[PDB]
């Protein structure tokens, strides 16, 4: 009744029980075609040791963090697919005639992880399928079967299990939710599976938030005081590990948060998607405005501060009671010196009082409508030390947006020059610099730690304009 790798082993296994559970460490691979590669003998045997350790069958005292074990079990099988069937056979082996319930429970966790990463080969699949089907009563067995179906559809993972996947596995839990944060200081729990792609999360988010579209939005990882965009086409759990590894090389699992935000500001027309405006756009543009990146007059700032106050406080006129606190949330930081505290309060209250009949949402949209045609609207900003132009200040502000690359004087906020996409011929970056070339022309060279981000945004804007 219970299907076994016994008959499979006659044709495809090494020769010396061998297809049944044992606590004795393997000394060569199980599959004859893996056994045929002496260079794979050591990895095949280290995988088995980690499997033994994970299931609790290794009589050691040095206990290992689970992620280190799952990394050992799966990482090299991803790079060298010849090992993929070997990992399956080693796991199903330890699940066959295993009379220790803890060990067997742990083995099913490994099979669950494994079927989220890659399928068996053509020849092993009917045996793995029957193995699972004849044990459909095990807690994780029905999902193992579904995961094989899904990974054959989407193709294999590139990174081993994420700590979130492993923690679900160790709980014998097959449903996973990941928190996603938004720029308006809210969050949602989003269900994800082993083969979820970043874009799948975004699709679900747009439904949940009732967005008209998420074009130009993505997920982002906030980690080690960086905020790094995630590739839409990547598997979500591959992206988390790839970015973590990169951060650890470029600069103890690392704490992190995932945000959903607008990345590319293309054809943003405030009022077209009010939910997008009030959840994403207002709350991303507001802090850039408050930092003083735009060229703004005193009267501009009074007008926008009335809308900002309404968006933040609705009907509560009492919050301007102490100007020293609140002014920083209402007026760009380069302009607060322009008038005294009481003059700011008087002017802002007069402007705010015009919004009695507006909603908070209407105030946020009006704020966006009033600034959306500014050349610095809809931008990512970078403060850099430029080394290519003697007539510019050493430190300049750089904006990257729909228009290309803007160089801005940090004191006057004037536009020093614009590099339109239609004229940029190349750019490159290192970890300490960013360089861009225009025509035959002009060159920009600057010191920055954010070249990788400038590169990402330029590549993304060019790709979107080409499509």
């Amino acid at each position: 009744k219970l299907h076994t790798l016994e008959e499979f082993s006659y044709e495809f296994f090494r020769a010396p029980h061998l297809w049944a559970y044992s606590c004795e460490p393997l000394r060569q691979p199980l599959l004859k075609r893996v056994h045929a590669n002496v260079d794979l003998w050591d990895i095949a045997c280290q995988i088995f040791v980690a499997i033994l350790r994970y299931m609790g069958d290794y009589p050691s005292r040095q206990a290992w963090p689970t992620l280190e074990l799952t990394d050992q079990i799966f990482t090299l099988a991803l790079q060298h697919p010849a090992l993929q069937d070997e990992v399956y056979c080693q796991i199903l082996k330890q699940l066959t005639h295993n009379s220790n319930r803890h060990s067997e429970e742990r083995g099913w966790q490994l099979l669950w992880l494994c079927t989220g990463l890659f399928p068996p080969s053509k020849g092993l699949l009917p045996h793995a399928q029957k193995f699972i089907d004849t044990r459909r009563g095990k807690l994780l067995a029905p999902d193992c079967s579904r995961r094989i179906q899904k990974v054959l559809r989407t193709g294999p993972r590139k990174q081993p299990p994420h700590q979130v996947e492993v923690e679900a596995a160790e709980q014998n839990v097959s449903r996973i939710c990941h928190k996603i944060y938004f720029p308006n200081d809210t969050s949602e729990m989003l269900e994800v599976v082993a083969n979820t792609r970043v874009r799948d999360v975004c699709d679900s988010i747009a439904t949940r938030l009732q967005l008209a579209s998420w074009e130009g939005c993505s997920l982002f990882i906030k980690i080690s005081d960086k905020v790094i965009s995630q590739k839409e086409g990547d598997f979500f759990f591959d992206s988390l590990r790839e970015v973590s590894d990169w951060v650890k090389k470029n600069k103890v699992t690392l704490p992190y948060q995932v945000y959903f935000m607008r990345k590319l500001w293309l054809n943003i027309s405030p009022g077209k998607d009010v939910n997008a405006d009030t959840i994403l756009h207002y709350h991303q543009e507001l802090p850039k405005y408050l930092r003083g990146f735009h060229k703004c007059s005193r009267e501009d700032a009074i007008h926008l501060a009335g809308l900002i106050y309404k968006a933040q406080f609705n009907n509560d006129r009492s919050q301007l009671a102490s100007v020293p606190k609140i002014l920083r949330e209402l007026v760009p930081e380069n302009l607060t010196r322009l008038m005294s505290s009481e003059e700011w309060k008087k002017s802002i209250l007069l402007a705010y009082d015009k919004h009695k009949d507006k909603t908070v949402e209407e105030a946020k949209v009006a704020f966006l409508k009033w600034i959306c045609r500014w050349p610095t609207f809809g931008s990512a900003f970078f403060e850099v030390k430029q080394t290519s132009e003697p007539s510019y200040p050493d430190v300049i502000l750089i904006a990257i947006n729909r228009h290309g690359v803007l160089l801005i004087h940090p004191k006057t906020k004037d536009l020093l020059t614009t590099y339109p996409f239609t004229k940029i011929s190349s750019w490159s970056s290192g970890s300490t610099y960013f360089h861009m070339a225009l025509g035959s022309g002009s060159r920009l060279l600057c010191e920055t730690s954010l070249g990788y981000k400038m590169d990402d945004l330029l590549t993304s804007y060019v790709q979107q304009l080409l499509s």
Binding site: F220, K222, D225, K226, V227, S229, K249, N250, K251, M261, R262, K263, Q284, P287, K288, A380, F381, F382, E383, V384, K385, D394, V395, S428, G430, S431, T432, Y433, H435, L445, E447, T448, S449, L450
Partner: protein, 119 residues
Amino acid sequence: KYEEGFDPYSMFTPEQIMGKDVRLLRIKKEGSLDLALEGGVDSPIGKVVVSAVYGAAERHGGIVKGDEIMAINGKIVTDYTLAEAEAALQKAWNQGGDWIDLVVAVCPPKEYDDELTFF
């Protein structure tokens, strides 16, 4: 620094050090250096700079991302390609004695916010 008595003017012409804060580091050979480099003459910055300190470089202190490598055991590398600079650094680490001497132009403090995260 790691030797106080170093005078840059005795090894470089003034044109070569104009505007640079040039110091001498002595790094004790133990373990791997794990000092990553970028740049080179074939690059937009036209000089060899530290891209990451992972660790013998980390443990010495005195050398950080952005510092320029101007000489390795007395050989001036300001005109080396990146590959040439890496080979010279690896060779110096492997062959020779207890210490490597790096002359570095220390990158000055940043008077800008190098960590903006807005999109």
